[PDB]
């Protein structure tokens, strides 16, 4: 039941993990719509770095598309493509 | 590999998943140890709500324990456990 040190290290430094991430905030121009849904799960540098200075970033990445439905408030509404960024490879830099 | 919408819709939609979430943030008034790893993983409530106006809650709780690194800047460090809350379930709630 006690997680061990080890455990805990490794499993909370610096990598890929899902991550549900705000369609506004990927897509702050599209200011007219709403989405549904309003968030989508993709897979994001999380975590911490050995050191307070260091920072948990991106070193490859890859998109993915979705069906998201585009909606008009109160006058429309439509299921389209759309593309997000994810992250492949996460490494510990400075900031 | 285009994700289709009701799997967008249903990975992404409130409830319980894994977040890295740092330690200081859950033990605010520490102000004697630093912590390795800085951060923990836990299942935390995320994700959206079919109400943009309603925010992701937890409904369930429980404790988890892991042992973690204390450290005395310029004293010591000492590996010992600490308890985190985990959300077993959520549900959207009023903001």
Chains 1, 2 share one sequence.
Request: glycine fraction near 6%; charge should be negative; proline fraction near 7%.
């Amino acid at each position: 039941e006690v997680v061990k040190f080890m455990d805990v290290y490794q499993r909370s430094y610096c990598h890929p993990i899902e991550t549900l991430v705000d369609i506004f905030q990927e897509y702050p121009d599209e200011i007219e719509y709403i989405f549904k849904p309003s968030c989508v799960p993709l897979m994001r540098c999380g975590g911490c770095c050995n050191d307070e200075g260091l920072e948990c970033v991106p070193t490859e990445e890859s998109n993915i598309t979705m069906q998201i439905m585009r909606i008009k408030p109160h006058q429309g509404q439509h299921i389209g493509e759309m593309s997000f960024l994810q992250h492949n490879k996460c490494e510990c830099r400075p900031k």
